[PDB]
Amino acid sequence: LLEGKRALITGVANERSIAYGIAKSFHREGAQLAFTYATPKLEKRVREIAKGFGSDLVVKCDVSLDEDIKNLKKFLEENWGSLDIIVHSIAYAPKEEFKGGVIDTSREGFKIAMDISVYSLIALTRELLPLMEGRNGAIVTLSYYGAEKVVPHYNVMGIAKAALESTVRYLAYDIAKHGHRINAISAGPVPITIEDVGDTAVFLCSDWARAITGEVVHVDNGYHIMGV
Amino acid sequence: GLLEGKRALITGVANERSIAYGIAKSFHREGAQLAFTYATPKLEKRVREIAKGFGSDLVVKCDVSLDEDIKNLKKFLEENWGSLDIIVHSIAYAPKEEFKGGVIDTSREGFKIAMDISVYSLIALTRELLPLMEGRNGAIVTLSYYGAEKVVPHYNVMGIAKAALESTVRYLAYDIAKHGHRINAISAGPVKTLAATGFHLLMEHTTKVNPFGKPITIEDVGDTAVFLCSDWARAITGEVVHVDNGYHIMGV
Amino acid sequence: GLLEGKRALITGVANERSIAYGIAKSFHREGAQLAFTYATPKLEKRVREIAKGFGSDLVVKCDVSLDEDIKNLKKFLEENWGSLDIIVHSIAYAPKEEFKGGVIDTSREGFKIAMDISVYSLIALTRELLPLMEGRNGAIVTLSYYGAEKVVPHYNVMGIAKAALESTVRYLAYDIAKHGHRINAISAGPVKFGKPITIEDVGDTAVFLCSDWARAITGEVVHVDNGYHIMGV
Amino acid sequence: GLLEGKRALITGVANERSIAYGIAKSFHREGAQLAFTYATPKLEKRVREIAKGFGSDLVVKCDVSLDEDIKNLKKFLEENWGSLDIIVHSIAYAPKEEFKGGVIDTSREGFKIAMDISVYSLIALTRELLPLMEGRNGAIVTLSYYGAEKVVPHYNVMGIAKAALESTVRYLAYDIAKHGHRINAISAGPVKTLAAITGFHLLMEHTTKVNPFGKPITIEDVGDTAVFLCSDWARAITGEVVHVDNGYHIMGVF
């Protein structure tokens, strides 16, 4: 339960977004919410979604842009002045990258995949950590089994998610000095539901999970266990 | 109230410092009804007193080395509940001599005991009690330790047992899924318990190395156990969750 | 050749299709001298015949469930060789009943037997034979399977045993490194892309892992499985 | 030798302390014919002299950040060999500043460079050179580090890179298997190289104290493992990460 907690939600595009399921569970559990939208064409839907949860706090943020990350800090500084939770649900590679195999990955497509899907977590964490000072905050990100095993056609995203899980470990080391935690949910195809992810996110971002950091929790109906 | 209307069997309570006591405490807070085993006749008194403190009258002797004790446990729960939601498996033992040198010095008999009590008991309890869980959204949780994954000097045969335990969890998840049940492990960091050679140094080293510079508590385990045994974790099975203040991340 | 001047004990040969036979074959090719255990009297004839074909007359009965058989094996090696370089541990068993149903159906006695034969035997052999390896920089190799890591239906208690075995390899690596020795596991795919491997695949990997070329490798599990382990399907 | 009649491309030699030099040395002992890349014009002389020492006249400049250099590398190998058995990928870089604090302090540009040079280069080289391996039983080996799996302070963005690299190896194994080829990683322990950074001495000391042998690995340990992994003895081994680290990876206390 997240009473008194202020959470930033990234990655809401619509009502089927994994981040929507997280926001839904967070709202139920008493969290106040703020949202990013990735592009201008998503602003209307994200604003409506935020309003449906009683939030008017919506800000444009292209995570490939340093200036947008700094602007996000400023927006949160001005409207809240502190922060408890970051939900990082941002993953992208150009669609061409999923055709063929990893062997067919373009250099630019690789750069884009890593920057959006992995570096964005570092940039958000660095920039927003000051807002969390003295709060014992929590960050959660999303991964997939393709990080650990070959899922054909997942391609560069399997590489990105392996990098992401390592990033979670290093960031856990960094931010523990300031009292904060960061974990990943390795989600099955959304099969699980977005609500399965959301309820797991609530726990991991709650004080009940105070001893859990740098962990990857599989929310996948046990898919990960199978050897055949 | 995440466990409202849930019935949970708690194994492994010896005293108020036991990991299972932490689990009972969190489960109680969250609305679970509790039943307890005690391992040896000497523990009866304090386990009954502990149960009473949680509003439970259900305490029964169960030495998991004994097939008849497991059967009688089932009979006891059939009479007093007739359905079951949760099994907390917090049982680990090896003769103390097995911790003195290295794994190379493990005795055959000590090995057999360690695996039987620390691993096989999970299989026996799961098989025996599964019928009582029918129609329920059952959850089982067991306790492991990082010594399953890496070498922790003096943990020895228990590092072998815990690796077997985590594999056992995976196979059991596969078995019990078709009955609508889940099973997971909590890989807990060191806690100063009655149950837990070289402990002081292990505890000190772990505390120094983990990113928080502090040990976990039995309450940390309990709160994680609540989640994993609740319907919020309906999509989580065969998983090992580290409740260790980040110790598992370090490559120093 | 890679194993010249090295003396290797081979456990687990039952016949020419035994994984240990492939290891013995590769070991022989590479110049190792060989000694064999046989598990039961009814296997003596075939094992002696196999040993002879490799130019060995060093064959000894060893039921690894028996402490006295393990002590006796040390004596046999002390008498005939007086030193040792390599142990090949290829010993895994559970009563056939245990592979019916799932792990949930495992009997207590079947579990005890599986762990004792498949896992504890490695500890007992390593402890007992380590003195013979003194000052040689020895190497031990054991066998595992992907069912240690992931669920392979019907592998059951052996999946538990193999997970325990791999952990045992790590702890033993820690123990024996201070005496200059190494121990590793080969996680073999099913035996003769992600297709069945051969006993020769295992054998040539065993030679490397038990050679001085692998001097920096210990407590490792090497998958010899045509890449099966990578798949998330 | 185990590599008799095999032709191997060696990337990443800067001097005789380089991990790739150890690999070249073992490969040479074992009968491989060698070709070398050098990363920058300043390394040319050094790498040509090292190649000469192994009886090789095949050295070519290849900056892996450049698509045209990878294309020209292929053209060079087509002209001088026309077939290829082995690629040794020993390429890792991030700007020095990235090792100074924690991963939290990583710059966007330093991250991009690290991933491009340390990870993407493997994909580029594998894709470009695979045709030269057609009909051969090819093998590729790359170098990783335990920082891919666990937190090694100050290894930072390289620990992210190496985790991506190990995943890249798995996916490439899947891709190249249908052409009869294999690819593996050696997760090597610390070695004092030109390339190996903030806190190196302490990392080296700590690793040496903690590993069960109480000593670091050598470039020759890596070389001998690479020979096996790139030989037909390892025909059944692909997508694997092999720790060549004197047992460091087993330790759960430090």
UniProtKB/Swiss-Prot annotation, chain A:
Record InterPro entries: Enoyl-ACP_Rdtase_NADH (IPR014358), NAD(P)-bd_dom_sf (IPR036291), SDR_fam (IPR002347)
Species per Swiss-Prot/TrEMBL record: Aquifex aeolicus (strain VF5)
Known function: Catalyzes the reduction of a carbon-carbon double bond in an enoyl moiety that is covalently linked to an acyl carrier protein (ACP). Involved in the elongation cycle of fatty acid which are used in the lipid metabolism.
Keyword flag Lipid metabolism: yes
Annotated binding of NAD(+), by residue: G11, S17, I18, D62, V63, I90, K161
Gene designation per UniProt: fabI
Record text on subunit structure and interactions: Homotetramer.
Protein name per its UniProtKB record: Enoyl-[acyl-carrier-protein] reductase [NADH] FabI
CDD domains for the chain: ENR_SDR (cd05372)
UniProtKB/Swiss-Prot annotation, chain B:
Keyword flag 4Fe-4S: no
EC number: 1.3.1.9
Active site: Y145, Y155
Domain of life: Bacteria
Any one GO BP annotation for this protein: fatty acid elongation
Catalytically driven reaction(s): a 2,3-saturated acyl-[ACP] + NAD(+) = a (2E)-enoyl-[ACP] + NADH + H(+)
Record bears the keyword NADP: no
Pathway(s) this gene product operates in, as recorded in its UniProt entry: Lipid metabolism; fatty acid biosynthesis
Enzyme class: oxidoreductase
Membrane-crossing residue ranges in chain numbering: none
GO molecular-function term, one example from the UniProt record: enoyl-[acyl-carrier-protein] reductase (NADH) activity
Record-listed substrate binding positions: A94
Sorted UniProt keywords: Fatty acid biosynthesis, Fatty acid metabolism, Lipid biosynthesis, Lipid metabolism, NAD, Oxidoreductase
Binding site for NAD(+): G12, S18, I19, D63, V64, I91, K162, V191, K192, T193, L194, A195
CDD domains referenced in this protein's UniProt entry, alphabetically: ENR_SDR (cd05372)
Quaternary context: Homotetramer.
Similarity annotation: Belongs to the short-chain dehydrogenases/reductases (SDR) family. FabI subfamily.
Protein's job: Catalyzes the reduction of a carbon-carbon double bond in an enoyl moiety that is covalently linked to an acyl carrier protein (ACP). Involved in the elongation cycle of fatty acid which are used in the lipid metabolism.
PANTHER family per record: ENOYL-[ACYL-CARRIER-PROTEIN] REDUCTASE, ENOYL-[ACYL-CARRIER-PROTEIN] REDUCTASE [NADH], CHLOROPLASTIC
Name used for this protein in its record: Enoyl-[acyl-carrier-protein] reductase [NADH] FabI
Gene from which the chain derives: fabI
